[PDB]
Design a protein around this ligand. Sequence first.
Ligand code: MG
Lengths: 194, 190, 197, 187
Amino acid sequence: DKSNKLQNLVAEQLVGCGFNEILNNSLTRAAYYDGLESYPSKNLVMLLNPLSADLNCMRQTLLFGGLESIAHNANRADLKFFEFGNCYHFDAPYSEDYHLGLWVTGSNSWAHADETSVYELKAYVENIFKRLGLDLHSLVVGNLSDDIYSTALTVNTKGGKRLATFGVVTKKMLKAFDVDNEVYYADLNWKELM
Amino acid sequence: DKSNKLQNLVAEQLVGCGFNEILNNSLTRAAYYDGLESYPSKNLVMLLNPLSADLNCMRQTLLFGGLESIAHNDLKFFEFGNCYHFDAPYSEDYHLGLWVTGKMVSNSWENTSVYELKAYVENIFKRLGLDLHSLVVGNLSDDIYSTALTVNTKGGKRLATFGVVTKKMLKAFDVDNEVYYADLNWKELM
Amino acid sequence: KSNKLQNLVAEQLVGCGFNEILNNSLTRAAYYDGLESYPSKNLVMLLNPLSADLNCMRQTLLFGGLESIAHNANRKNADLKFFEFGNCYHFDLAPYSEDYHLGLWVTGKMVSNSWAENTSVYELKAYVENIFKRLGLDLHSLVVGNLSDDIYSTALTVNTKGGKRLATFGVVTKKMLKAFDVDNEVYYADLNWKELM
Amino acid sequence: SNADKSNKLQNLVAEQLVGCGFNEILNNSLTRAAYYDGLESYPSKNLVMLLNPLSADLNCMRQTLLFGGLESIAHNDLKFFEFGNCYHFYSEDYHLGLWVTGSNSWAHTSVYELKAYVENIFKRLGLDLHSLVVGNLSDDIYSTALTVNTKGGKRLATFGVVTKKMLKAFDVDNEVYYADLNWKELM
Ligand SMILES: [Mg+2]
């Protein structure tokens, strides 16, 4: 109920900020994870006879679905998408966790150099954090450069639980998914924010 | 888009009728489907190395999760969730399930509870702006329901199924009260 | 104020599963042929009509909504619920006048000759009642009359004690659904918005 | 029998209320349709009307105990209660009504005392307080009120402050706090 009410509130808040809520399938492609360090293939919840099926595993991250939606969007530089959803993980060796993903897509002039950056995403994230009554001074923030992120921040409790990751998707990953304009991605560990 | 708002409107309406929302794992046990006809074992989306763990497949039906929840805890539960089907042989579909507990199972002296359950479903349909007159209602008793109604389009597409869960099924789940179960094919209703 | 209330009523209707529609004010004079409720002689005719289908300004919202229902046919199992705010025009120094209306259209069952309109007027009555409440209108001040004409098989009128029409709503005639290629029943309300202010 | 049980609990509650200073009142089941003219909460359309209603002062069955209690208040800090059948289109439902009438100096009236009496009735009846859903209400009867429902949504009680208008109609001054408990539903 706490989750459900707070999900509703976070959604209303994000829609009020011009976000669109998306829904992607939990069924996904194992190949997306081939070679990955942050979401390794060995931790995929694989399905039976996976050679004979295109969708052959359960998603370990929301990220790839979001990239598919962006790539497929008729209007694809002003996109703000969010998705609440279960992800799946193999080490009970199997686990199901609930995530909130955010996707924000993004001139010449001196006057208008102050506009599209990761910081607009960080603001969205902070505002979610404040709406959940998170103590901002408790947070331990670290740095990440990834197979998914060229740069990004990790956000942990003083106790060590991962609360969030957010940053700038590598251009390579964007090329892989047929997306041209910059993408800022946040993965919020929803259970840990209660 | 329209789905999200309606889910919310339906969740609120159900809470107002004293329902509590539940969330069950999409990972489940193939053994639940053993010898079922309505949700055949052969249509289960099994996991790779199914012997490696207790959880060994994706759910085909929301039903069993709800029975587990009833057997865990007069209950009224609802759940929005994906189910998974093996026929790209692997698909996912979105369902709304309702569980309503009734009287203790006894040998003492089902019609009237199906019609209480039907009232909740009607009110869901109205909230979805559905044309009640366009529906075709059928009778059903199977391995899931001793007594149930099916709701089809005039073309014969299934939109909902609801009724009384078999005593055998109740027994399989250590459930001691009668259970009234609805499964709404939510995507089909959009 | 009118603007504030229009927004409030729109939000309420959208909340109830309505979609707002917008239809052209330029329309077809032949729709009004032989009508008594909106007579052909009271139409505001164009000096330079574009065609037989575009030769006058609308006298009623009704017809545009029936066109919209016709164009919104679906294979889904859902009622269409539409509303529209718009001006209508009347010919009677200044013979041409305009007034502002809110129309509501709600579709029902497929037209059939099967056994079993009373319950339809009662369902539409609720949306109208809640609009009135939203406008702070005092229900017990209103006088409700019965009506049957070329538009409605069965209808209610809502009037002030003085006899001023505030709303009309009911079941659209079968003949009219047919003439518009609409194959579901239609419950239609016309609220005279300015009079509600 | 069920009626034997209702009778016993009715007596326990009546003794408890009397002990607390209430007087039991009894009013006619026959009433005036005029009372219900224009009401939303108890619609005129739902009265069990008697034949030739224009030719009888008392021309219908009561839907609510409220009006008889207001008549009783006029005719006498009062505390009144009444058990009695109500009628509407078909239902006969037994109800319990409670009426309580009501400084400004810092050292030293409201609905809170009425709530306490209601809560004490719920407890006498073994009703689990923690399963109850409370809502707000404002209408032609109450300027402010709480509604009390079961989890599933069945109305068990309504209690609050009667509108000054309603009280004006029955020649009643000051404040009246009124509770209507759906006795049948509490059995
Ligand atoms: Mg006392």
